[PDB]
Symmetry: C2
Subunit: 178 residues, 2 copies
């Protein structure tokens, strides 16, 4: 099953320690991405609609940068994923995907980066990703109710709690690298 | 030749593949597809002054998941981080001490409820791997509020006081406990 590979990846991301070197991320990409894999992200920030694409050797560094900002966990939620097979390719079209990154101290903010995700899988036993396209539409940010009690209390320092920490779902550490 | 916790993902896949008017026949087909005909579901927590353990059988399991969405909840999925499995001759047990039952509510505030706790599941070691025992011990629960609600409803500290007062009780909503008791 294709999404079973996506689940196996969700468990491996949870085995990521705060001391995961580049050697661990390379083993992470080699386990799910083909040697010729490419990753594409599309968003609409502010200078005009953009589109970036990285290669196989730049993929392990991409998933490394998402955690380089207080992010403790990363998993993908796939609502209503439409598959489509070929003779030697498996395409997974999920229009309701949410890249969830859970942050840590000081405010355990949860970010739900929603958008469309397309994946082309190889029809082998490794069944690794050959193409990763994630089109971003929106991002939903949530703050634990505990933080709204100790921090903010009520009317004050709401500008930190009313202003977003991420940009179009992705943090401020994954744009200068792109 | 397949890992048991994959059943939780296959279960998570159908919970979101649910319509707004799901009859009980669809929930019964959902239960027979993941639970044995003699399955049992257990919830353990420490609410009042002491332990409260509940247990229902196969015929009431699909109705338990019906109560989750009838409290304004629009989505429900389970996260199993650091899951310890266990194979035997005719049983497969999955012990996940760090599980989060995530329930997303709807209007007006769109609160996300993370009912966290220890989860144990006993799977049958046959060619279906359906659940025989579901025991979910609850330890904590966190509620998360969208920053958008805190932006427009930012003013006026009384919503900011209600945004610090929880809507659920120990993770489960006010509609799935009157049915449990």
């Amino acid at each position: 099953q294709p999404e079973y590979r996506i689940y196996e990846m969700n468990k491996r991301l949870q085995s990521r320690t705060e001391d995961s070197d580049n050697l661990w991320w390379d083993a992470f990409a080699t386990e799910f991405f083909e040697d010729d894999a490419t990753l594409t992200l599309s968003f609409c920030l502010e200078d005009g609609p953009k589109r970036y694409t990285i290669g196989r050797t730049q993929i392990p560094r991409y998933f490394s940068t998402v955690f380089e900002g207080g992010v403790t966990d990363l998993y993908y939620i796939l609502k209503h994923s439409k598959e489509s097979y070929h003779n030697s390719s498996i395409t997974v079209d999920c229009d309701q995907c949410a890249m969830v990154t859970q942050h840590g101290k000081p405010m355990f903010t949860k970010v739900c980066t929603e958008g469309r995700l397309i994946l082309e899988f190889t029809f082998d036993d490794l069944m690794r990703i050959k193409t990763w396209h994630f089109t971003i539409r929106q991002y939903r940010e949530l703050v634990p109710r505990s933080i709204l009690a100790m921090h903010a209390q009520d009317p004050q320092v709401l500008d930190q709690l009313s202003k977003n920490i991420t940009r179009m779902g992705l943090t401020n550490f994954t744009l200068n690298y792109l």
